[PDB]
Paper text:
Replacing the 3-tert-butyl moiety of isoxazole with less bulky isopropyl showed comparable inhibitory affinity (6c, 77.3% inhibition). However, this compound 6c displayed an affinity twofold higher than 4b and exerted a considerable [name]α inhibitory effect with an IC50 value of 0.203 μM. The most active member in [name]α assay 6c elicited modest anticancer activity (SK-BR-3; GI = 33.17%, MCF-7; GI = 11.92%). The five-membered ring isoxazole derivative 6b, possessing a tert-butyl group, displayed a good binding affinity (KD = 0.44 µM) as well as the isoxazole 6c, featuring an isopropyl moiety with a comparable binding affinity (KD = 0.68 µM). The isoxazoline moiety of 4b, isoxazoles of 6b and 6c, and phenyloxazole of 8 bound to the hydrophobic pocket B are oriented in a parallel direction to the phenyl ring of Phe138, isopropyl of Leu107, and perpendicularly to the rings of Tyr139 and Trp162, as seen in the figure. Overall, these interactions are quite similar to that of BIIB021, as expected, i.e., the purine made almost identical interactions while the pyridine ring was oriented in a parallel direction to the phenyl ring of Phe138 (π–π stacking distance of 3.7 Å) and isopropyl of Leu107 (π–σ stacking distance of 3.9 Å) and perpendicularly to the rings of Tyr139 and Trp162. In contrast, the crystal structures here pointed out that the isoxazoline derivative 4b, isoxazoles 6b and 6c, and phenyloxazole 8 showed less π stacking interactions, in a variable degree, with Phe138 and Leu107, due to either having lower aromaticity than the benzene ring (6b, 6c, and 8) or even lacking aromaticity entirely (4b). Thus, these five-membered ring-featuring purines had a relatively less stable conformation than BIIB021. Considering both biochemical and cell-based findings, the isoxazole derivatives 6b and 6c and the p-tolyl derivative 14 displayed promising [name]α inhibitory activity, with IC50 values of 0.203–1.76 µM. Furthermore, the structural findings revealed significance of conserving the aromaticity at N9-substituent of purine to make a proper angle between the purine ring and the aromatic ring (107°–110°) and achieve good binding affinity and hence considerable [name]α inhibitory activity.
Numbering used by the authors: 16 to 224
Write the structure that this text describes.
Amino acid sequence: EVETFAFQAEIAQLMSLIINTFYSNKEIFLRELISNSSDALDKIRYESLTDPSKLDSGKELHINLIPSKQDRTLTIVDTGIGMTKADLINNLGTIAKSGTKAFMEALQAGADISMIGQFGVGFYSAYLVAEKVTVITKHNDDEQYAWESSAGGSFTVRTDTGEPMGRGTKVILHLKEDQTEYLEERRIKEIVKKHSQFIGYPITLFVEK
Ligand SMILES: CC(C)c1cc(Cn2cnc3c(Cl)nc(N)nc32)on1
Ligand SMILES: CC(C)c1cc(Cn2cnc3c(Cl)nc(N)nc32)on1
């Protein structure tokens, strides 16, 4: 079963702005996704201090960056807390409404798209480089889900039948045809050292076979 949902109007407007605005400094998407992964790793680590069983789904706390030339994808994998079905459909978007409005107003007052993370909605910077984003996620005591959207005002959620992940999130960026530089090892290394060099979890940049 695939369920299709409409974005909140403000989120759809944000996605259109990210897709349509002329803005050359697209590389900031990676720092935003790595920051989200780091936040998710912080959360599971904190919760494990009072409930060690929360790591029964995996003790390693890390971030992997995986390019695929065959699929034209860059995947950001973390073993953080993961997202529930309710997170994916309702709750993260409810939280994001506030930051979206503030970000859009800041842009009209002279802010820049690279500041998106200061409003807590940096996930959507993925659409600077991706025509479609697939999110595979697994939270303890919920199922493994695939969320997906090519924008246009809707997203889907389904139970995921792929390789079980244990716990965490994979953000699969289906890159636009002109954004394949983000598959290059040298380019990702440059961006990670520029914007994400103090993240408190190991970041492994996989190499393409
Ligand atoms: C899927 C769309 C709707 C989305 C993604 C985000 C950012 N985000 C919130 N919780 C997260 C966790 Cl637990 N892990 C990671 N990696 N990112 C997270 O917010 N909305
Ligand atoms: C694991 C948790 C603490 C977390 C928080 C974030 C920040 N963040 C980035 N983009 C977001 C969107 Cl679009 N929505 C919402 N609600 N939060 C977003 O990322 N992960």
